[model samples]
Target chain A: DRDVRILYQVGDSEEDLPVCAPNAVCSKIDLYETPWIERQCRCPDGRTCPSSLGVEDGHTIADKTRHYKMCQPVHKLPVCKHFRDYTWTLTTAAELNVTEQIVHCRCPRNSVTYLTKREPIGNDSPGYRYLFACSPLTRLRCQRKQPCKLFTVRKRQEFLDEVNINSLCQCPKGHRCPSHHTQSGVIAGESFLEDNIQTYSGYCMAN
Target chain B: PTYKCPETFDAWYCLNDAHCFAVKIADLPVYSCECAIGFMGQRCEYKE
Candidate 1:
């Protein structure tokens, strides 16, 4: 008697995705000596599909041989966009404790203006918030109005925020400060220097 | 038992007596064979 090795069969006439046994996934089964592939249900619920089978989404397949894998639910943040910076990035790492990929959002120009507010970032970390303020770099506020000269200068271009964290505080662009201006506001021997002392407004008038 | 070459679901042939077993490393799939160790050939068939 020829022993028939049972195999998985997915015929065109067969029903769509055959029903599986309780708590098992329906998967294809193959044989070494036969061309016929069949379907079968195996593995306990929530368990990884057998490695002998194909890798499927939500299937805990070993990344390495002899390595263990389990179907672990992962939380991912949906992508977002901003109105100002093209490279706007959302980070939880800056908070107290964070663990996950940083989400990046596209920043477009000409949005709202004037305010720093915290916005909820992702569903993964529900309470996580990121501060994004609209900056209208569309036109130079101080540079557009001033003809200029360097007042006081910082080492490099900086954000120029209130905290002085990482931004450069200096006169507006296209301006330079005179040599005789004192660090204490007034010029070497003259009265208080408005053009020289003020850093946020842009360049100090050279003329 | 004969050593098995990795089953990479790719073009891996065991010219002689060997099996191809699939091995994944860090989400990457790779293959190995006994022919590579003792036997010598394109598919590790010739013995040295």
Candidate 2:
């Protein structure tokens, strides 16, 4: 369960999509039965539902307590042992530092970190921290474990494996994810550097 | 040998009776072109 201190990414929030607020006609992400009766009061999936939340006597002062709308499903990717229908959009092309990143809660084993179709920002891992990155192939893994054997292989081998994986099953395809994108003549960039040494230039990444 | 599909404007022939396949110029956005399966090269020129 995603207790209180949870972090999530939401998208297409163009007013049409809102967060979960009780006391409204809408239901939870799973539409689970709640103390509040969910009303079908005219809303379509993705855009329907009063998406409101209910409250006790915190009543009607507005801002602090009230029902809210829910947009986005907690959907799952293929191979996901557990799944949800919720989803969020990723439209910004910004990068962020990952270290010093705080979490409101913790994740149990067996669950993969959540991701949306957006470029993520994270800090280079310090001594014993988990590594988070934006690359789909390694988009944010706990630097704790070693990479797959595929990582140690040569570049050509890595390429072949990507092709083979696609031939068999799907990956986060269609969008040029973790690939390259352009940013104002500057061309947004990233490099794989060695932790002990420095830089992902000609040598480190090659080694 | 199993029977096959036809080709208009182009043809699928057995080259040296070994490799029988269709030959065409694939527009590979990045590279000018590429060959299809069972065939290789730019203009149906070279063979495997």
Candidate 3:
């Protein structure tokens, strides 16, 4: 019988199209006579491609799809802009049990704020809400050595409708609350606080 | 019998012992590497 081990060929070839680095366009055949080929996409000299691959639109060859990627400037991606906390309580009605909900907003990931405080709202009739206080992530600048405070505000849940639940945030005192100010005017202090609070942006102002 | 992936159409494109398999595209067998969770990249070289 003829030896088959020597027939196999494995390596990159000039004929292969350039693909994104870390990822490459590769091809091979079962027959020992055929050579395995691959072409790695590369960025300009000294530059590097991201670990992720980008797909080329409408580019297909022999049923295999081709991808397109480019080398770009390097930068770190932020983990999260802010952290969200959710809370809820269950209570029984005359015929049906219902749930009261709320959320507490806090600083972004891996950061801290100052002057954090909490104030209580509502009574035991249905549930209780707490207002938290803290400073903004941007104002603090550094994660360490800054004096920090925690506080809370109440609003609707992030993904849910119907104001049955309150979303809370950690806000700084005498500064703008980090969470958006309540617009319905049902809360006692919210109306007066609304004047100093920027709508929708959630930045409270000193006044 | 156990068989090495390099002996087949995969032909050693995958890295880090990633699983190699072939799928038909336009009736032609095209090989791809499936990276495990927390690992990514065409050759399974990057980790999240």
Candidate 4:
């Protein structure tokens, strides 16, 4: 069984990757075993094709192995060149509750940006348990005019190299997925500083 | 009894060994799952 393990880079440099070799970051454990590869989705009534499957749309994953939103790229967003800073506004505020009732981020291209990327990150961390089922799960809003591309191993690497290493994304013949960037914003800084989101969906040719 | 996930259906949860966590018809979990392994938060995990 080919297990495509979910790994992440906890630090900055190659050392930050859970198990890194040289400058590349990666997961040492294989995440997925063979036989559990393909996915099947049935659209809602009158819908032959399933456009999306995740919490944002309030849809639950029908499979036990994958949580809904596995590769949110299922749906496509318009490729508009007019990229802009992801605009954030207060949608609701809690009454003296030390938090706002409704606050959300909206991108000009409309919700469901390039890909409904990794949200509510952290493993068993208090930062976000899907916002403890309280606040609306934070959605992505690609920064206006910022670089936006789909998550690909090679592409992700090239993108990270371009962003961090000031290079380009071009993984070797065997690799495909690139690093995971925040759903909306420039890479580097305090955001991606936590864990590398690129490991979620790797670029290997697994079946 | 190996829990055979219903074929050609939407995602759902099945009780795993040790009664610990749950998996989402996910690729990683199903890959690593075993009789000795239990589930975790989102990704299917096996505890030692």
Candidate 5:
């Protein structure tokens, strides 16, 4: 008799739980009676509630005594405009060597990205690596052609060498080839360090 | 949270998102990101 009375008391409680869709708002005082009943939760439309935050999604705006989570528009981030691959060797102190592949990223028109400082992948290893990310364009120190340098493991040794790497010098968007300048080609005019660092070079030319 | 290299290392070292793996180079496992076709960058964020 006591168990039956407890079950009746539990069932008689008027409390209700909130049901909502993913990322939707829910009303705390609304009742979840059945599927036939109108829903207390609402999925926001992205067009109606636009996002003001940057590329990343899931941002909210604050109003007077209320908060609104707006749907973010699809904003694609800038990608590498040009790229290349190089295979180099890594020499260790223990007479063991390893071959590793490295990639290079070039910026698009009116953008710039620089190579990061080369650092070792492991604490006790000599194998060094670097990376690049696209960024807005800015004034550079060197204007004339410069040697495109890269670190290579040659004959069980690692050293910085001038190699024929692409995107070392990026010109403005309006700059064109033949009349202006090409991406890369044979080095002309003057030679720096009076040594053979690279067979080719790229520069920002003027008409 | 998504699986990332310890200490928030940008495994963008690999051009292919799925190619980032760990290899024993010395006393510890060093994570290496591999490259994929038509993509480039430490994190393979750029497309060809």
Candidate 6:
């Protein structure tokens, strides 16, 4: 029906990963999908149009178990980039009289695709409202053109007595999508304790 | 089971010296090395 937000973790190092995002309300550590690897930050619903929004491919339950396992960070880690490169202009701002120290970083040179969220400084002494950071994740292209079919899962479960309708699938494998989307508020440095956080975003055209 | 350092001669360089000496413990299947005065870290990977 509508877009579904799955769980995903951005940022490689602990210093970068976000403690939480502003817009995500009902989001939590998912034990529902696969459950083998938890901590999926905000993945799209099980099924969505291939070319809806965001450059990364968000996966469903059956997609993980069945056909597409080679899609490196796509299913679990969805990263975004290809918007800028080489000494991009950055801005920094911090709230006055704020106590909490929050930080956000966009992308590191980890070759993995995903956003970053940092834990709060805890000591709420106030911090930057904005800062500069490298764009997150490099734009990735599917190397091989994979011809995939619709995969459905069985509803037979010990937890459920009736048929639990669960229909899910994956995007075209090795289908590298060239996106023209733009994002803002990438965390290059520290954090801001206050709200109304406004930050500039950049993407690498070449670098 | 056997404990071994990385197999390349250039595997680990002690901080002060360009080479690290791997010394086997007596009656033990493990090996330890003396990192040069200048280097100390997981793999003697630092020069400080």
TM value for model 1: 0.21
Which residue pairs come into collision in candidate 5? B12-B42, B12-B43, B13-B42, B14-B33
Model 6: DockQ against the native?
0.03
lDDT (C-alpha) at residue B3 in model 1: 25
Best by DockQ: 5
Predicted structure with the largest TM-score when compared to the true one = 5
Cα error of candidate 5 at position A68, Å: 43
Worst 10 residues of 2 chain A by lDDT: A161-170
- Each model's lDDT: 0.28, 0.21, 0.27, 0.22, 0.30, 0.24
User: Chain B, candidate 5: TM?
Assistant: 0.42
Residue range A50-127, candidate 6, lDDT tens digits: 222232443221211211111122333322232222111111123221111112222334321111112232365332
Q: List per-candidate RMSD values in Å.
A: 31.7, 22.3, 29.9, 22.2, 24.3, 20.7
TM-score of 4: 0.16
- What digit string (tens of lDDT, one per residue) describes model 5 on residues B1-48? 113332222311333463654333322233444446765543444565
Q: What is candidate 4's CAPRI-style docking category based on DockQ?
A: incorrect
- Per lDDT, the best of the predicted structures is 5
Error of 3 at A180 (Å): 62
Q: Tell how far residue B15 is off in model 1, in angstroms.
A: 78
Instruction: Give the 10-residue window scoring lowest on summed lDDT in candidate 4 chain A.
Output: A129-138
lDDT tens digits, residue span B1-48, model 6: 223332322232122353433222111111223456664332233354
**What lDDT tens digits, residue by residue, belong to model 3 across residues B1-48?**
112232322323444666765332111222345666665443444464
Model 4: per-residue lDDT, tens digit, A1-207?
Answer: 333223232223333322211211011111112112112222223333222323354222222112322222223322222122221111111222121111122223222221111233345533321111111211323233322222211122322221211112223354332333333322333212123322121122212
lDDT of 2 by residue, B4-35 (tens): 21221012121222222221111100011123
List runs of model 6 lying over 4 Å from the truth: A1-20, A23-36, A40-55, A58-103, A108-120, A124-207, B1-48
Interface RMSD of 5: 14.4
Q: Tens digit of lDDT per residue, candidate 1, span A103-164?
A: 13212333322112245666675543433323322222333433122122221113211100
Binned by DockQ into CAPRI classes (incorrect, acceptable, medium, high), candidate 5 is incorrect
CA shift of A188, model 2, Å: 27
